[PDB]
Design a protein around this nucleic acid. Structure first.
Length: 86
DNA sequence: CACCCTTTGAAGCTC
DNA sequence: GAGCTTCAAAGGGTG
């Protein structure tokens, strides 16, 4: 199937906190909410931060276990995308 | 109903 | 190895 890229730190931070943000705040609009995740990152102690790099790597390994050598490109260049040359 | 806007990181692609 | 480009999430807002 479209085996998604192995999500990084902030994508998990989103998955966890974003639900809470959306429950707490008036906002839903992902681009604003994601800048909220950006802000919320500043609350993470160095250890809480580190946890994400661990988690990210856990997911990375899960990806490798579920799909031995699944190379990222499940949809590379399918979305047009804005900014592009970030 | 796909892309915009946004965030970081990885990992695609390109050189 | 050094670098540039796209998807991942994601939801109203835009198109």
């Amino acid at each position: 199937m479209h085996i998604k890229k192995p999500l990084n730190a902030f994508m998990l931070y989103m998955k966890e906190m974003r639900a809470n943000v959306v429950a707490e705040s008036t906002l839903k609009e992902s681009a604003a909410i994601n800048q909220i995740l950006g802000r919320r990152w500043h609350a993470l102690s160095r250890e809480e931060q580190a946890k994400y790099y661990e988690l990210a790597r856990k997911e990375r390994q899960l990806h490798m276990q579920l799909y031995p050598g699944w190379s990222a490109r499940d949809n590379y260049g399918k979305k047009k995308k804005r900014k592009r040359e970030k």
